[model samples]
Target: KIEEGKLVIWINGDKGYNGLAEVGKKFEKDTGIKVTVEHPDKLEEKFPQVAATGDGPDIIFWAHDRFGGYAQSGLLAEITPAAAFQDKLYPFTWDAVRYNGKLIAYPIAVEALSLIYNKDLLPNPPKTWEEIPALDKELKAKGKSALMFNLQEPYFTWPLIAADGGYAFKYAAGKYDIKDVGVDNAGAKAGLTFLVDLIKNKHMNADTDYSIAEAAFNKGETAMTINGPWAWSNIDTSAVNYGVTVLPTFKGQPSKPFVGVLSAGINAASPNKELAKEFLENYLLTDEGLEAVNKDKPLGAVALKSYEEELAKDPRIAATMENAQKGEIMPNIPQMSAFWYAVRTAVINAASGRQTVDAALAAAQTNAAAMSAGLDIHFRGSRNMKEKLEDMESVLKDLTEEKRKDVLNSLAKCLGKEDIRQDLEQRVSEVLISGELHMEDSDKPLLSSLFNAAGVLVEARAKAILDFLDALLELSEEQQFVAEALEKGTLPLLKDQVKSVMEQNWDELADPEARILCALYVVVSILLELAEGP
Candidate 1:
């Protein structure tokens, strides 16, 4: 709104940089405006500070899951495409960009795992997890694998888990209820058990990664690989006699992969807001616009209705969309930030045999409960904009107030004086909403001790720290990556490593143990900060 005749964009990866640049050039030519596209080195770092100050680019692009917190932080402008435009795109992509009932970003393409098989090796694809052990054994005799699964990746792991009713959060009727975590439920256990057994059965390697699966699939060493459309370019380039189709079921339950939407968003604070919107809608939303961006890397699946007939014609695209149709869009809620860390940590722990599947799930459930609300607080406080902070506090206070009702309902009738009860409730709510984490089943003991202790505040702080420490104890043993902490055993190294990086790119942290511990620190830090109160 400050200036005109220019637009700027930040592309996350180099996959389609040239095509995007060409689109931007065309945009400039048609609209008498100039466009600049930068692949910022520290976009994950740069955007939060700059966008808060309204000094960032006009547009930025990444997976849809990334935009959820941006929306909540007021970094993304809500887009209103034409009803016709909205109606034409694949419906599932809608869920990928919406957060808190607003369209926070524009969905361009979708990627989800599909069953891609070597027609020469696997005349029929393995159709269920139940048949995999036998299937792998039979294929081993032929010197080929039944499936090259990305074993350590929870994105690949999620389908079977979800097929059996394991979900990170409750997603229904196009909204996500982050408070209703379901990761430790029975369906999840059954689903993870199947994978654990595969490792135990020696049918799959514990360290199997995307590259391993990709390499095997490309060389025709594996009969089948569950992969996305981006694999199409290479498979087609290699000229393998291949077929693409939807992922197989697990025990007759429908396996639903995680659908990731590649999206473009207008920065809420852009000076060229209207021009940027016009550029996207006019120059980038059309066939020419789409083809340019897709020039280098083929999108796994397209969300545009224009791609429907092509879906039927191209077996690969058809399979991707078919999978997308059955898949759940990766949750775009900020709680998903914690879900990603928690679930992947559990997957890594379970796959490495560091912990049993049940133990892994329990640790993950507790970790998720510990991190959820805290992540909300973390996302809010990091906005670095005072006015926005005030707005967030207003919303958070209301939401947290309602949560107290749930809190009180869960506690039995045991109570102390009205002042003590009221004081305890205030401290507990601050801890819950501080980092925005909650105390569910396991932390109930910590809650009970708050009312029973001589000094309610001290006991609450001490108990919460101990509860989090215990959660870390479970994680420290399981997360193998942090075994690098050599001076003392796992716990001390975990503390130092986590504390050292607590203020860094936490949400973007790839190391499981460090990220988990960092958020845990954030939660406790807030609890301790509340201790300074009158």
Candidate 2:
């Protein structure tokens, strides 16, 4: 429980007041209560642990996707909005942050992905798939890509996969029908097949993940990437002038992105619950409050329609709103676990040349249906994604240890620009340890690929590295040790820690059950820092 006249709110993955520095001071000066905004490490893991025992932030801001999980676990207080909010707020948001017909959180901002393209590359963005070939020809001559996006990522591909009338689960009579999964339907196959074809035909880059796509666009290597607001937030705006618009159409249908809502919820375990409500309803949602917050944050489209005119002043944000309105609310339920696993599996299976699009999606359908019915069987050889990628030597019976090490070192060498690659090649001469640093079991392939990632043209190399980094980023976000490393901007601590572990606990580490959890996190922090060199 927190002290009286004091309020704390945790904002995920960011440091400092995050546009609240001004409003927080204003609130404190106006009232006796003080407002404090914090960015805690391992927020997803830490929040639940504290909230279960009646100790956590008074208020929390996060994606509405997790609303159901938290509410079911008894972390959020019921927020019953009165008629004023009911009339002004967008109706869709209420459905998103609710659990079993009860409003568990107040949604403040709504967002969705859009096609963001470099203005220098093309004055006009493509409106249909047919228009993309000209872009491919143009960029191909320049040794660049026409388009680059985070491939194998379900979140990024959901819009494309669902464009022609497909969905993870059917929502009828206001509840998701877990029994009806449309991921393998004809429409779904067509959508996913279209994407696979784009990659296979060289119309789009087969190897761009989140960071590489963002970095490439920032460096003007690619003309366009499917992205949204925060995707370009940290980009060097001075270098690149870009436009935001809707995704290109397939057949006659426009891609339907997932409309996600960001929510503000008071933890049910807060000591000053009544005060928290007063702060949320009276101060946080007021004209002056949202106005102040939006000035710094640029909340794309607010739930409150009152600020519509204010948001439309910038046409870029106007485009974001346009794309958001054309989409459906993202599914929010525990059953989504099955949907996520299935979609990721389908994407990787189809894109990696391991299976045909039809076969991959059909397998996904079987696994999703089974998972929805409370079974954890992984179809197609009964291995999870990690094991499937790692157990490759056994399946193929290929390269020797020396050959594999040469390949791994080559990846590390080709990781950056020509000059940087020279440095990395020399550096990899020393990165190796006597004993494989702590993890080299069934997880070694992912680790090796990650340690040697770059925006390279080798499709298979790029795909494995992309998958590894995306997974690594997620794992790091769940650990506090790397959290502190990223937060404090202390780069070498993790390297020191890794060395200490290798020196002290080498024998304590077990193979087969081996985990290089912290070492993987170290790779993310260092890679991110490497992107912005001194």
Candidate 3:
């Protein structure tokens, strides 16, 4: 194995540089391969540009998903038939480096977007995008930026569209077929439409600059935002009471996130290509090596086995992983770059008050369609967020007479605003808990009558239920401090609270006929009293 003069591997300067040294020492000790790990501030920028001219690092640490564009551009080499052990990787994790049927990146870690909210402004992250409007409306009325979105780019919005069953391109016949780009697809358009409504309703705070949004979120100028695992690096402690949850689902489907994977890939033109590949194989993908990389801050690996209690010991990391299951491999298709740029232009225009949402969407569709023959504007109809609305349906079914009456009366005040039904439901739930509204058996029948009066359609009912379900599941899954609160007789401790809160606050929450709240109050009260007994 001493056939090597020296192995020069380029890694990121700070964390990766140190971690690789330890790994390299062992690597050298075993085979005397003589390794040099070079890190520079401009590694990514320099490496890609250098590689284009056939002068690059033998081994480099890079994000697999984001690097897909470069790999497709032919600046990166394929880690094929040799790196086939990729099957051992998580499907979503392995996808980050996948390009044109050739594995271009050797995935060492995977990252996805998870909602981290200010608990002071929001006790919990809204379970769905629909809730963003209501919360934003409340905040805007108070003259605060209800929420901030990185309208500067499509990274935040595109994921929401994908969550709605939309996609930028479809894979077929071993090639990317953008012939049916889902920019105008129902799911994507609906997500865009929701964004429009949020802006029009003053629920969304536009900080087109990613840094601005991040700063705003951290400083509490905004209540919530969509961001990735990397945010962990910049977040400070004064931001405590913050919580984590997956992106809300759409159309009964989960919010699909783009997983950004980090991998050590060998340069295609390196003189010691085979040795570099060998280094990539054992030093990164091996179980121990995988563990080491995952140990690095904000480095998420696709190897599910890599997700251990020891690795995810931090409550925040655990919370991120809870939602991590929804992550997808960020597509490396060349058109994705063009697609996001077009989408950014569209969202930014709409956010800046320059264009109506429909016009913005229309412009984006045109630009994206024009960018490539594979991308067609009208190839398919739009996607439906109707499934997410199903949560409201479940809430409707479990309504108590009193809560029902309250909901109807509130809806009546805002009759033409039936779009605010979920908002109304959320408001009513908040009211009941605050005792601004009373709950009683006499309220159940009247509540049923109000739903009947509203002429609620089946589709609307289903969408409502889905929205509720998304919220309910998030609370149940994110037990950290809140779950402990409920368990220790703090806030939201009743069984009805658990079900109602989880199910969009309507199902078990609004029902008085079932006497759910009474039952919960009685049980919790009795337990508290018993514990206090002599």
Highest TM-score, which number?
1
- The residue ranges of model 3 lying beyond 4 angstroms of the native Cα positions read 1-48, 60-72, 80-88, 137-146, 171-176, 200-202, 236-239, 250-253, 286-296, 304-327, 354-356, 369-371, 374-534
- Pitting candidate 1 against candidate 3, the one with the higher TM-score is 1
- At residue 363, give the lDDT of candidate 3: 51
TM-score of 3: 0.57
User: How high is the CA lDDT of each candidate model?
Assistant: 0.64, 0.62, 0.54
TM-score of each model, paired residue for residue: 0.69, 0.64, 0.57
* Candidate 1 ranges beyond 4 A from true positions: 1-8, 11-15, 28-57, 82-92, 172-175, 375-534
For candidate 2, lDDT tens digit of each residue in 300-355?
67777677557767777778877777778777664455566667767876877777
Q: Order of candidates by TM-score, top first?
A: 1, 2, 3
Segments in model 2 whose C-alpha atoms lie over 4 Å from true places: 1-5, 14-17, 32-34, 40-46, 49-55, 173-175, 202-207, 232-236, 353-356, 370-534
Residue 299, candidate 3: C-alpha displacement in angstroms: 1.7
Clash totals in order: 7, 0, 34
What lDDT score goes with residue 66 in model 1?
Answer: 64
C-alpha RMSD values across all candidates? 11.1, 16.2, 24.2
Candidate 1 has what TM-score? 0.69
